[PDB]
Amino acid sequence: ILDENAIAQVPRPGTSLKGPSPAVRPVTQAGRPITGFLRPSTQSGRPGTIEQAIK
Amino acid sequence: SKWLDSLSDSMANIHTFSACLALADFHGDGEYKLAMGDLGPDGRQPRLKVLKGHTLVSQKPLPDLP
Amino acid sequence: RRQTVITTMTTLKKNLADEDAVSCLVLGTENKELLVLDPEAFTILAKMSLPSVPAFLEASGQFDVEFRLAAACRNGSIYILRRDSKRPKYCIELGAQPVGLVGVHKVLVVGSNQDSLHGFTYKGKRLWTVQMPAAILAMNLLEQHSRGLQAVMAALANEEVRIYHDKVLLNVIRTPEAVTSLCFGRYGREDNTLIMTTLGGGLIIKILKRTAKLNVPRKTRLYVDQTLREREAGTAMHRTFQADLYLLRLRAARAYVQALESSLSPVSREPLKLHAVVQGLGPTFKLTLHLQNTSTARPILGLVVCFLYNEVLYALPRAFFKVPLLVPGLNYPLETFVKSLSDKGISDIIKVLVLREGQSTPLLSAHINMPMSEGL
Amino acid sequence: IACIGSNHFYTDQPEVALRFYRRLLQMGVYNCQLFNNLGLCCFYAQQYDMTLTSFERALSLAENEEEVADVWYNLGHVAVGTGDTNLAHQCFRLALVSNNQHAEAYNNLAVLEMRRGHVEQAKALLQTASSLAPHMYEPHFNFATISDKIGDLQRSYAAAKKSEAAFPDHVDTQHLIKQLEQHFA
Amino acid sequence: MFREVLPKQGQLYVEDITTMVLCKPKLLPLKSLTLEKLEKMQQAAQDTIHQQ
Amino acid sequence: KQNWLIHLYYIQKDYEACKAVIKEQLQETHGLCEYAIYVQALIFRLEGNIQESLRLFQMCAFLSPQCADNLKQVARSLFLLGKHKAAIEVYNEAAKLNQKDWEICHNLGVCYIYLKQFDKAQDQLHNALHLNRHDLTYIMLGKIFLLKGDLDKAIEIYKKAVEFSPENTELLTTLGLLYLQLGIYQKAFEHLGNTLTYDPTNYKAILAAGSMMQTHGDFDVALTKYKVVACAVIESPPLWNNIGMCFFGKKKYVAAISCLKRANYLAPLDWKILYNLGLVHLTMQQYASAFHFLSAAINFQPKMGELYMLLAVALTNLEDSENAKRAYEEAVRLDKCNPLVNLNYAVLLYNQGEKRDALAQYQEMEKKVSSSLEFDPEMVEVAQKL
Amino acid sequence: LEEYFELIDHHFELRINGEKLEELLSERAVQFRAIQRRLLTRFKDKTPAPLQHLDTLLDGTYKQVIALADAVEENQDNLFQSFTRLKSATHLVILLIGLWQKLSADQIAILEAAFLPLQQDTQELGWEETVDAALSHLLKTCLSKSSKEQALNLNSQLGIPKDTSQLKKHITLFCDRLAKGGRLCLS
């Protein structure tokens, strides 16, 4: 949240990081359905605010 | 594309409805001005604005909302 | 005093139906009246009664010959008032309150609050209907006398003006911010200007140019080889699956009896449910217990909550506390403040027993893996 | 192999996912996740002779309380498929016993409850689920459906809206939202 | 002898009556080697603390 | 009393300036407006907050205690919650104040239907008809009839309904489905095709029409009609079950069970898809999956004879014949109007060398006669043998 | 029922003050965060840039944050003392209602469970919400008969109220319907 380093703010859909539908493939968050491999760097989303992250 | 945008202003305050937005040459000499009786931001300052071309020239204060 | 208000105005011609002639006024009031006045507003010429408060007005025809006064009211209907009406005598339903109206030569148009356009005739019969991909904000009467095209300018909430006319596909224009008021007319010197006022203030001016099969999956060789091995040896598979299922029922009954025995289930007369949430990342956590009585109608009076924790790692002020009268159907969040006492990062479990006062066997239990301290 | 295997399992090809996970098992991987995945791909590829032993191996290898809960959750799915709602009930309840914050176990247990007839139990369980995982469209949709079934169109709408927030292209949620908006007007 | 004759028509839905949705079976993701080693190290630290 | 601003901020889906003007107009008049609280309540209702539209419309009723509309709105906000008894007892006083509005009658009918009071609901909707008839009255009346008794009044009331306002799709499709559940078939196709003319790609009518076409052979036309909507609803268990049965009709068993497994992954608790999976695996001679899906569907639908017959057909080919016996015993005790169960049990007994009660099964079968092209030859061959 | 309601009103006033102070502190914290992020971005840039305006805004916002934190602490302590006095008040009121209508031990325990819910107020559960939900349920399933009243006036919710009007209405209604022969049950 508090570290901003991306230049754009509304980049074109397809040029930034920010399949089976949720009726088939389970999901961890709203988007980014469950993966097959956990690396210690997977994000599967971003929490919006600080309140959204602590809660 | 079938329209020529003469003015697309983004940060001037104009809050009127199509009923209180009438156009005429209220002065004569065959050149049309645009009268708009608007309430302003909310029901505080209703002021008849007259537009001639691209920029405002006069806002007459009104007693209540038009 | 009794204070009245005028809510809509519209004018109507006198004799020749041109712009060089004079135009008689029409007005609607909050007090249920509609006033047709002399074109200069110095004498009341026609008072009219309305079955409901008006919201929009429109008028067609000539005063002496015949005038048609379409008053779209707030009560979810329109009324066409004609000559010599002791009662307006003409009502038309739409099903909701209209966001505007437009009068083309013969047919009349009404925009429904439910995001559609409905073309009626002055008689009272619905002719055609069309849906809009967004909410209709406002409409007006477009015109172009050098062409003869007279359509509707419908402002939408998706930042667009859109309609399907009889034959040609016109009124298709985008905009940065949703437009709330429209006026097509001769502005300055040109005859085809279009002024618009959007939501967040602003101002838009557009000049119109005179030059106007199924996805059935694919089955590879693995599928056929395995249906072959099942066609040859289906009995072994069936027997071994039945054996494994008997063993599975045995093990599940075993684990379920153990959980009943140790009261480890947070859901299991005495209808209750409990889960716990830990909020916070520091040496202090808000442990909130959501406790709910899940029954048709009966409260649960005598309950208490105990916390079983490591008295070295965690400091709970109130471990034991009573539970209010659990009204059936309501979630009670009961907070507590856990504090990590370990000077290093050391986590541990915390159990929560919900149990009656008199008895001594936990009605149910919850477990919380307290997260790492991340403190000092 | 794990990524292509999961993808194959979820796009109506459990046999190919089974091939991939069997390859992971041949190369000497020995986990709880691997064996849960193998039991799932077996049950859904219709290899009924290798499913439940893989699930028991997974339960043996599980080294957490979330892994045990996931394996009991999947065993409950195998039970639901086999056609026994009592074993399924016990398996979802054991998934809850092992991990109290398991929104999917709550949702499925509430579905089975509502099948039995216990509407209040089901409503409370679906509320707990949709409070634990708000991103999951299934408890929202279920709560909205069984609220609209009993009236209560306020909560039905409040739940259909969060359903559509979680999975927007869901068709049944659109039909329910349109019905409720018609009722509101 | 006689083989067993079977029905051929099958069962068809005539209406899509709404039902209750179950969550779907979950394929557990496989942990990487680095993630496994980090978990191993933190668990070992917790353990070597617990023994005192 | 300048409320036109609040009105236009409401009707414009603004709902944020409208509340500010509500605050200003309650700061100018201190209430007593009867149209600011009304519109604030309608804001809260069209936003979905009815626990506050309730109190606001109740204030409106407090301001104009002789007005049918305020009591109407309070009882509507009561009905839009779960509370129907209170809604009825507020509609009662709203009717006391005026018995000329149809909405009171219709909503009373609905609320009575919720409390299983079908007699008074029928009477209230009768009066709702006789005052100013609307389609919803017909639909709710049909609901009463269908949940209460037989269809020999529902088809008549729905016919009366569709008679006028026939371009309505809901009435047409409901009448088509009622004919289908009834004996008639040609009229069902007539009305559903009418729906398809008015609405080209609606799910309900397309699904029902595809079911009809499937039952009368015609697998390709039904498959195309499914393709019409197979993208509007990409994940629906009924569509994929019907498509799997379409393919199973035209001997495409692999694609049939692919469609049926895709449907069953989306509805693990439905017995029709499981019956179909079991039947097709009996046809492909799997006998280790057929038994699985048939036993699952038996668990989900225990009062069916065809399911036990097919479980027994699967068990007979699994080297397990005593369970086949007892399954056939359940099947013959449960089944009444399908002699194929008796024929299969007779074939099992004959091939078991029994041949004495095989004649009992043959007699039970002939007491039930219905001719499939293969159900006759094996029947007569067992006959001449006994 | 008149020197009792004064303590309830005092308690609810303290609760409302605490909620207002919490919103003020929310705003101050958001502002402090924005200014601190501006200063951070300034620190990341290599080139010099005057910023004394920014840090003298930060100091003011921080002193306001400290003030609001101390005020919230004071209000929490005042609210706790008010809650402890209200506990004794409601103890005495239940005692008097039990002596006034000859209440049995179980009918006294139901009152002691409805009116004496919790130990202190928390930011999600408080006293008035709980006691009002419990009293509404008891009035709804034990004393009231009409359904319009059971659905309109007698409503159980568990959020901070807007005023103590409903709680006091229900306590007076509870007293008077006990006086009219009504007795307490559970289901």
mmCIF file of N, CA and C in Angstrom, chain C residues 3-7 30 53-56 73-75 93 97-99 113-115 135-138 179-181 199 213-217 219 223-224 226-228 230-231 233-235 237-239 241-242, chain F residues 1-4 7-8 10-15 35 42 46 132 134 223 226-227 230-231 234 240 243 247 253-255 257-259 261-262 281 284-292 315 317-320:
data_model
loop_
_atom_site.group_PDB
_atom_site.id
_atom_site.type_symbol
_atom_site.label_atom_id
_atom_site.label_comp_id
_atom_site.label_asym_id
_atom_site.label_seq_id
_atom_site.Cartn_x
_atom_site.Cartn_y
_atom_site.Cartn_z
ATOM 1 N N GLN C 3 -48.508 28.235 0.203
ATOM 2 C CA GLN C 3 -47.475 28.525 -0.784
ATOM 3 C C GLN C 3 -47.493 27.482 -1.893
ATOM 4 N N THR C 4 -47.687 27.941 -3.125
ATOM 5 C CA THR C 4 -47.690 27.085 -4.302
ATOM 6 C C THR C 4 -46.337 27.136 -5.005
ATOM 7 N N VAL C 5 -46.166 26.242 -5.977
ATOM 8 C CA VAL C 5 -44.913 26.110 -6.719
ATOM 9 C C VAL C 5 -45.237 25.703 -8.151
ATOM 10 N N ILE C 6 -44.491 26.262 -9.107
ATOM 11 C CA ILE C 6 -44.540 25.842 -10.504
ATOM 12 C C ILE C 6 -43.407 24.857 -10.743
ATOM 13 N N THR C 7 -43.701 23.763 -11.453
ATOM 14 C CA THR C 7 -42.738 22.684 -11.618
ATOM 15 C C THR C 7 -42.357 22.382 -13.062
ATOM 16 N N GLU C 30 -47.589 22.178 -8.219
ATOM 17 C CA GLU C 30 -47.593 21.117 -7.217
ATOM 18 C C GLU C 30 -48.995 20.907 -6.665
ATOM 19 N N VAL C 53 -49.834 15.024 -9.202
ATOM 20 C CA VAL C 53 -48.863 16.108 -9.380
ATOM 21 C C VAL C 53 -48.057 15.870 -10.654
ATOM 22 N N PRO C 54 -47.893 16.866 -11.521
ATOM 23 C CA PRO C 54 -47.137 16.666 -12.758
ATOM 24 C C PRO C 54 -45.633 16.694 -12.525
ATOM 25 N N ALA C 55 -44.917 16.109 -13.475
ATOM 26 C CA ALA C 55 -43.461 16.083 -13.448
ATOM 27 C C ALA C 55 -42.833 16.573 -14.740
ATOM 28 N N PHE C 56 -43.498 16.368 -15.874
ATOM 29 C CA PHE C 56 -43.000 16.828 -17.160
ATOM 30 C C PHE C 56 -44.180 17.220 -18.034
ATOM 31 N N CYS C 73 -46.982 12.588 -15.253
ATOM 32 C CA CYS C 73 -47.061 12.878 -13.833
ATOM 33 C C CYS C 73 -46.087 11.997 -13.049
ATOM 34 N N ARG C 74 -46.000 12.249 -11.744
ATOM 35 C CA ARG C 74 -45.139 11.471 -10.864
ATOM 36 C C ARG C 74 -45.770 10.156 -10.429
ATOM 37 N N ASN C 75 -47.088 10.008 -10.563
ATOM 38 C CA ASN C 75 -47.798 8.825 -10.095
ATOM 39 C C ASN C 75 -47.621 7.618 -11.011
ATOM 40 N N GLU C 93 -50.996 4.322 -18.775
ATOM 41 C CA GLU C 93 -50.054 3.722 -17.844
ATOM 42 C C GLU C 93 -48.735 3.414 -18.538
ATOM 43 N N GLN C 97 -42.395 5.905 -12.965
ATOM 44 C CA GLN C 97 -42.276 7.347 -13.144
ATOM 45 C C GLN C 97 -41.371 7.643 -14.333
ATOM 46 N N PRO C 98 -41.765 8.538 -15.237
ATOM 47 C CA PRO C 98 -40.970 8.758 -16.449
ATOM 48 C C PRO C 98 -39.875 9.787 -16.227
ATOM 49 N N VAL C 99 -38.706 9.522 -16.822
ATOM 50 C CA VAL C 99 -37.570 10.433 -16.709
ATOM 51 C C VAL C 99 -37.592 11.529 -17.762
ATOM 52 N N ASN C 113 -38.189 5.129 -16.086
ATOM 53 C CA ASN C 113 -37.169 5.084 -15.045
ATOM 54 C C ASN C 113 -36.459 3.740 -15.003
ATOM 55 N N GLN C 114 -37.066 2.694 -15.571
ATOM 56 C CA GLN C 114 -36.450 1.376 -15.655
ATOM 57 C C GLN C 114 -35.593 1.211 -16.908
ATOM 58 N N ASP C 115 -35.059 2.315 -17.439
ATOM 59 C CA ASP C 115 -34.026 2.294 -18.478
ATOM 60 C C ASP C 115 -34.545 1.724 -19.802
ATOM 61 N N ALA C 135 -28.728 3.778 -17.638
ATOM 62 C CA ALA C 135 -29.815 4.550 -17.052
ATOM 63 C C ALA C 135 -30.025 5.843 -17.827
ATOM 64 N N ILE C 136 -31.275 6.124 -18.180
ATOM 65 C CA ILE C 136 -31.604 7.346 -18.907
ATOM 66 C C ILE C 136 -31.577 8.518 -17.934
ATOM 67 N N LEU C 137 -30.690 9.478 -18.196
ATOM 68 C CA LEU C 137 -30.583 10.663 -17.353
ATOM 69 C C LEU C 137 -31.538 11.759 -17.813
ATOM 70 N N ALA C 138 -31.508 12.101 -19.100
ATOM 71 C CA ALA C 138 -32.395 13.127 -19.627
ATOM 72 C C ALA C 138 -32.476 12.997 -21.139
ATOM 73 N N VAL C 179 -23.620 12.666 -19.200
ATOM 74 C CA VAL C 179 -24.291 13.921 -19.521
ATOM 75 C C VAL C 179 -25.685 13.927 -18.907
ATOM 76 N N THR C 180 -26.048 15.050 -18.279
ATOM 77 C CA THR C 180 -27.295 15.162 -17.539
ATOM 78 C C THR C 180 -28.318 16.096 -18.170
ATOM 79 N N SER C 181 -27.903 16.997 -19.056
ATOM 80 C CA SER C 181 -28.855 17.864 -19.737
ATOM 81 C C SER C 181 -28.392 18.106 -21.163
ATOM 82 N N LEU C 199 -22.411 15.488 -15.451
ATOM 83 C CA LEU C 199 -22.692 15.271 -14.036
ATOM 84 C C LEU C 199 -21.848 16.185 -13.156
ATOM 85 N N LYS C 213 -20.738 -26.940 -32.918
ATOM 86 C CA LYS C 213 -20.271 -25.669 -32.381
ATOM 87 C C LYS C 213 -19.995 -25.786 -30.885
ATOM 88 N N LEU C 214 -20.566 -26.818 -30.269
ATOM 89 C CA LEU C 214 -20.500 -26.969 -28.826
ATOM 90 C C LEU C 214 -19.073 -27.248 -28.366
ATOM 91 N N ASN C 215 -18.806 -26.906 -27.108
ATOM 92 C CA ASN C 215 -17.502 -27.147 -26.494
ATOM 93 C C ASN C 215 -17.499 -28.486 -25.754
ATOM 94 N N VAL C 216 -17.869 -29.532 -26.477
ATOM 95 C CA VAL C 216 -17.764 -30.889 -25.937
ATOM 96 C C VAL C 216 -16.293 -31.293 -25.931
ATOM 97 N N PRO C 217 -15.748 -31.726 -24.797
ATOM 98 C CA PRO C 217 -14.293 -31.895 -24.690
ATOM 99 C C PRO C 217 -13.777 -33.008 -25.589
ATOM 100 N N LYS C 219 -11.455 -36.407 -25.946
ATOM 101 C CA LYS C 219 -11.046 -37.555 -25.145
ATOM 102 C C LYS C 219 -9.859 -38.229 -25.819
ATOM 103 N N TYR C 223 -8.222 -41.945 -22.008
ATOM 104 C CA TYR C 223 -9.604 -42.276 -21.699
ATOM 105 C C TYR C 223 -9.984 -43.642 -22.258
ATOM 106 N N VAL C 224 -9.610 -43.927 -23.509
ATOM 107 C CA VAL C 224 -10.025 -45.195 -24.101
ATOM 108 C C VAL C 224 -9.269 -46.356 -23.468
ATOM 109 N N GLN C 226 -8.258 -46.508 -20.389
ATOM 110 C CA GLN C 226 -8.782 -46.769 -19.055
ATOM 111 C C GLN C 226 -10.209 -47.304 -19.087
ATOM 112 N N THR C 227 -11.038 -46.873 -20.040
ATOM 113 C CA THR C 227 -12.343 -47.511 -20.146
ATOM 114 C C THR C 227 -12.206 -48.944 -20.640
ATOM 115 N N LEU C 228 -11.119 -49.257 -21.346
ATOM 116 C CA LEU C 228 -10.850 -50.641 -21.720
ATOM 117 C C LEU C 228 -10.468 -51.474 -20.501
ATOM 118 N N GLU C 230 -11.307 -50.920 -17.563
ATOM 119 C CA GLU C 230 -12.507 -51.088 -16.751
ATOM 120 C C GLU C 230 -13.482 -52.070 -17.380
ATOM 121 N N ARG C 231 -13.545 -52.120 -18.710
ATOM 122 C CA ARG C 231 -14.411 -53.088 -19.373
ATOM 123 C C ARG C 231 -13.937 -54.513 -19.136
ATOM 124 N N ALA C 233 -11.830 -55.560 -16.471
ATOM 125 C CA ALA C 233 -11.622 -55.875 -15.060
ATOM 126 C C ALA C 233 -12.444 -54.957 -14.166
ATOM 127 N N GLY C 234 -13.737 -54.825 -14.462
ATOM 128 C CA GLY C 234 -14.578 -53.951 -13.662
ATOM 129 C C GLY C 234 -14.917 -54.507 -12.295
ATOM 130 N N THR C 235 -14.932 -55.835 -12.156
ATOM 131 C CA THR C 235 -15.350 -56.441 -10.896
ATOM 132 C C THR C 235 -14.324 -56.209 -9.797
ATOM 133 N N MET C 237 -12.253 -53.625 -9.589
ATOM 134 C CA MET C 237 -12.409 -52.225 -9.214
ATOM 135 C C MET C 237 -13.621 -52.028 -8.317
ATOM 136 N N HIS C 238 -14.743 -52.656 -8.662
ATOM 137 C CA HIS C 238 -15.952 -52.493 -7.863
ATOM 138 C C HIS C 238 -15.756 -53.032 -6.452
ATOM 139 N N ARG C 239 -15.194 -54.235 -6.337
ATOM 140 C CA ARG C 239 -14.999 -54.832 -5.022
ATOM 141 C C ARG C 239 -14.030 -54.015 -4.180
ATOM 142 N N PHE C 241 -13.320 -50.841 -4.440
ATOM 143 C CA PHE C 241 -13.918 -49.572 -4.050
ATOM 144 C C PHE C 241 -14.914 -49.759 -2.917
ATOM 145 N N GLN C 242 -15.693 -50.842 -2.945
ATOM 146 C CA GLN C 242 -16.621 -51.080 -1.842
ATOM 147 C C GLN C 242 -15.875 -51.356 -0.542
ATOM 148 N N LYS F 1 -42.370 23.066 -0.142
ATOM 149 C CA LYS F 1 -43.237 22.459 -1.144
ATOM 150 C C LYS F 1 -42.693 22.675 -2.555
ATOM 151 N N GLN F 2 -41.375 22.864 -2.651
ATOM 152 C CA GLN F 2 -40.675 22.988 -3.925
ATOM 153 C C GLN F 2 -40.113 21.658 -4.408
ATOM 154 N N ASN F 3 -40.745 20.550 -4.025
ATOM 155 C CA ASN F 3 -40.147 19.219 -4.043
ATOM 156 C C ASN F 3 -39.656 18.742 -5.407
ATOM 157 N N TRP F 4 -39.902 19.514 -6.471
ATOM 158 C CA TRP F 4 -39.516 19.065 -7.806
ATOM 159 C C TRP F 4 -38.020 18.799 -7.909
ATOM 160 N N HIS F 7 -37.481 15.450 -6.394
ATOM 161 C CA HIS F 7 -38.063 14.495 -7.329
ATOM 162 C C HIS F 7 -37.120 14.218 -8.495
ATOM 163 N N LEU F 8 -36.534 15.271 -9.071
ATOM 164 C CA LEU F 8 -35.676 15.076 -10.235
ATOM 165 C C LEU F 8 -34.310 14.519 -9.855
ATOM 166 N N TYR F 10 -34.083 12.297 -7.468
ATOM 167 C CA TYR F 10 -34.436 10.894 -7.282
ATOM 168 C C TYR F 10 -34.542 10.172 -8.616
ATOM 169 N N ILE F 11 -35.413 10.664 -9.498
ATOM 170 C CA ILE F 11 -35.718 9.995 -10.750
ATOM 171 C C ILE F 11 -34.526 9.936 -11.697
ATOM 172 N N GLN F 12 -33.431 10.614 -11.370
ATOM 173 C CA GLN F 12 -32.242 10.626 -12.206
ATOM 174 C C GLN F 12 -31.180 9.642 -11.735
ATOM 175 N N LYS F 13 -31.495 8.797 -10.753
ATOM 176 C CA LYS F 13 -30.538 7.853 -10.176
ATOM 177 C C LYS F 13 -29.310 8.588 -9.636
ATOM 178 N N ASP F 14 -29.566 9.727 -8.991
ATOM 179 C CA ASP F 14 -28.483 10.501 -8.399
ATOM 180 C C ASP F 14 -28.202 10.050 -6.969
ATOM 181 N N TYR F 15 -29.203 10.142 -6.095
ATOM 182 C CA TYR F 15 -29.227 9.518 -4.774
ATOM 183 C C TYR F 15 -28.110 9.991 -3.852
ATOM 184 N N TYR F 35 -43.569 14.587 1.011
ATOM 185 C CA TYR F 35 -42.988 14.164 -0.256
ATOM 186 C C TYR F 35 -41.472 14.138 -0.234
ATOM 187 N N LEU F 42 -38.268 5.936 -0.814
ATOM 188 C CA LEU F 42 -38.119 5.282 -2.109
ATOM 189 C C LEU F 42 -36.656 5.181 -2.532
ATOM 190 N N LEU F 46 -35.199 1.538 -3.458
ATOM 191 C CA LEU F 46 -34.517 1.220 -4.707
ATOM 192 C C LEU F 46 -33.024 0.997 -4.526
ATOM 193 N N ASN F 132 -59.234 -4.829 -11.584
ATOM 194 C CA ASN F 132 -58.449 -4.424 -12.751
ATOM 195 C C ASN F 132 -57.398 -5.508 -12.972
ATOM 196 N N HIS F 134 -54.454 -7.926 -14.018
ATOM 197 C CA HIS F 134 -53.077 -7.851 -14.483
ATOM 198 C C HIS F 134 -52.494 -9.257 -14.527
ATOM 199 N N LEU F 223 -30.288 -30.613 -30.635
ATOM 200 C CA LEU F 223 -28.907 -30.208 -30.399
ATOM 201 C C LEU F 223 -28.637 -28.813 -30.947
ATOM 202 N N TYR F 226 -30.226 -26.325 -28.618
ATOM 203 C CA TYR F 226 -29.350 -26.141 -27.469
ATOM 204 C C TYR F 226 -28.158 -25.266 -27.819
ATOM 205 N N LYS F 227 -27.591 -25.447 -29.013
ATOM 206 C CA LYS F 227 -26.483 -24.602 -29.449
ATOM 207 C C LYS F 227 -26.896 -23.138 -29.503
ATOM 208 N N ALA F 230 -26.391 -22.301 -25.894
ATOM 209 C CA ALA F 230 -25.303 -22.980 -25.194
ATOM 210 C C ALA F 230 -24.173 -22.034 -24.819
ATOM 211 N N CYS F 231 -24.282 -20.757 -25.177
ATOM 212 C CA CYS F 231 -23.305 -19.765 -24.760
ATOM 213 C C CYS F 231 -23.896 -18.710 -23.840
ATOM 214 N N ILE F 234 -23.390 -21.073 -20.230
ATOM 215 C CA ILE F 234 -22.317 -22.004 -20.556
ATOM 216 C C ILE F 234 -22.190 -23.088 -19.493
ATOM 217 N N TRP F 240 -26.446 -29.321 -20.090
ATOM 218 C CA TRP F 240 -25.452 -30.332 -20.423
ATOM 219 C C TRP F 240 -26.002 -31.741 -20.262
ATOM 220 N N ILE F 243 -27.887 -32.219 -23.450
ATOM 221 C CA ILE F 243 -26.966 -32.388 -24.569
ATOM 222 C C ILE F 243 -26.324 -33.770 -24.529
ATOM 223 N N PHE F 247 -26.559 -36.614 -27.489
ATOM 224 C CA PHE F 247 -25.479 -37.403 -28.074
ATOM 225 C C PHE F 247 -25.695 -38.893 -27.847
ATOM 226 N N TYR F 253 -21.443 -42.166 -27.446
ATOM 227 C CA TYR F 253 -21.430 -42.414 -26.008
ATOM 228 C C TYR F 253 -20.325 -41.638 -25.303
ATOM 229 N N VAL F 254 -19.164 -41.500 -25.941
ATOM 230 C CA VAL F 254 -18.042 -40.832 -25.288
ATOM 231 C C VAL F 254 -18.356 -39.359 -25.059
ATOM 232 N N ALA F 255 -18.797 -38.659 -26.107
ATOM 233 C CA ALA F 255 -19.219 -37.275 -25.940
ATOM 234 C C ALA F 255 -20.427 -37.171 -25.022
ATOM 235 N N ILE F 257 -21.064 -39.011 -22.300
ATOM 236 C CA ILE F 257 -20.653 -38.990 -20.903
ATOM 237 C C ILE F 257 -19.707 -37.841 -20.613
ATOM 238 N N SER F 258 -19.055 -37.262 -21.621
ATOM 239 C CA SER F 258 -18.302 -36.041 -21.358
ATOM 240 C C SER F 258 -19.241 -34.903 -20.980
ATOM 241 N N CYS F 259 -20.331 -34.746 -21.732
ATOM 242 C CA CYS F 259 -21.327 -33.737 -21.385
ATOM 243 C C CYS F 259 -21.981 -34.046 -20.044
ATOM 244 N N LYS F 261 -20.715 -35.764 -17.509
ATOM 245 C CA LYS F 261 -19.781 -35.541 -16.413
ATOM 246 C C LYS F 261 -19.553 -34.057 -16.171
ATOM 247 N N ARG F 262 -19.540 -33.246 -17.232
ATOM 248 C CA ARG F 262 -19.473 -31.805 -17.023
ATOM 249 C C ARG F 262 -20.703 -31.302 -16.284
ATOM 250 N N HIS F 281 -23.116 -45.916 -18.855
ATOM 251 C CA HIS F 281 -22.057 -46.870 -18.554
ATOM 252 C C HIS F 281 -22.553 -48.306 -18.570
ATOM 253 N N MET F 284 -22.186 -48.776 -22.422
ATOM 254 C CA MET F 284 -20.792 -49.018 -22.771
ATOM 255 C C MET F 284 -20.197 -50.195 -22.014
ATOM 256 N N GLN F 285 -20.991 -50.858 -21.171
ATOM 257 C CA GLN F 285 -20.581 -52.066 -20.460
ATOM 258 C C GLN F 285 -19.381 -51.800 -19.557
ATOM 259 N N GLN F 286 -19.512 -50.786 -18.705
ATOM 260 C CA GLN F 286 -18.478 -50.486 -17.724
ATOM 261 C C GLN F 286 -18.684 -51.285 -16.442
ATOM 262 N N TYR F 287 -19.890 -51.220 -15.876
ATOM 263 C CA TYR F 287 -20.355 -52.093 -14.802
ATOM 264 C C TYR F 287 -19.631 -51.854 -13.485
ATOM 265 N N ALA F 288 -18.605 -51.009 -13.492
ATOM 266 C CA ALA F 288 -17.960 -50.570 -12.267
ATOM 267 C C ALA F 288 -18.190 -49.098 -11.997
ATOM 268 N N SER F 289 -18.597 -48.346 -13.015
ATOM 269 C CA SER F 289 -19.052 -46.973 -12.894
ATOM 270 C C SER F 289 -20.564 -46.865 -12.989
ATOM 271 N N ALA F 290 -21.186 -47.671 -13.850
ATOM 272 C CA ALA F 290 -22.641 -47.722 -13.910
ATOM 273 C C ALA F 290 -23.233 -47.974 -12.534
ATOM 274 N N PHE F 291 -22.706 -48.975 -11.828
ATOM 275 C CA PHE F 291 -23.194 -49.265 -10.487
ATOM 276 C C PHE F 291 -22.980 -48.078 -9.562
ATOM 277 N N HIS F 292 -21.842 -47.400 -9.694
ATOM 278 C CA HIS F 292 -21.549 -46.252 -8.842
ATOM 279 C C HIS F 292 -22.603 -45.162 -8.996
ATOM 280 N N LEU F 315 -25.223 -55.199 -11.193
ATOM 281 C CA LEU F 315 -24.718 -56.190 -10.249
ATOM 282 C C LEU F 315 -24.668 -57.584 -10.852
ATOM 283 N N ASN F 317 -23.759 -58.396 -13.770
ATOM 284 C CA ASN F 317 -22.513 -58.481 -14.515
ATOM 285 C C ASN F 317 -21.295 -58.181 -13.654
ATOM 286 N N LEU F 318 -21.440 -58.228 -12.330
ATOM 287 C CA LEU F 318 -20.336 -57.998 -11.406
ATOM 288 C C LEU F 318 -20.063 -59.211 -10.528
ATOM 289 N N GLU F 319 -20.494 -60.400 -10.957
ATOM 290 C CA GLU F 319 -20.289 -61.638 -10.208
ATOM 291 C C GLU F 319 -20.932 -61.579 -8.826
ATOM 292 N N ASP F 320 -22.017 -60.819 -8.692
ATOM 293 C CA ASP F 320 -22.677 -60.598 -7.406
ATOM 294 C C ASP F 320 -24.180 -60.650 -7.666
#
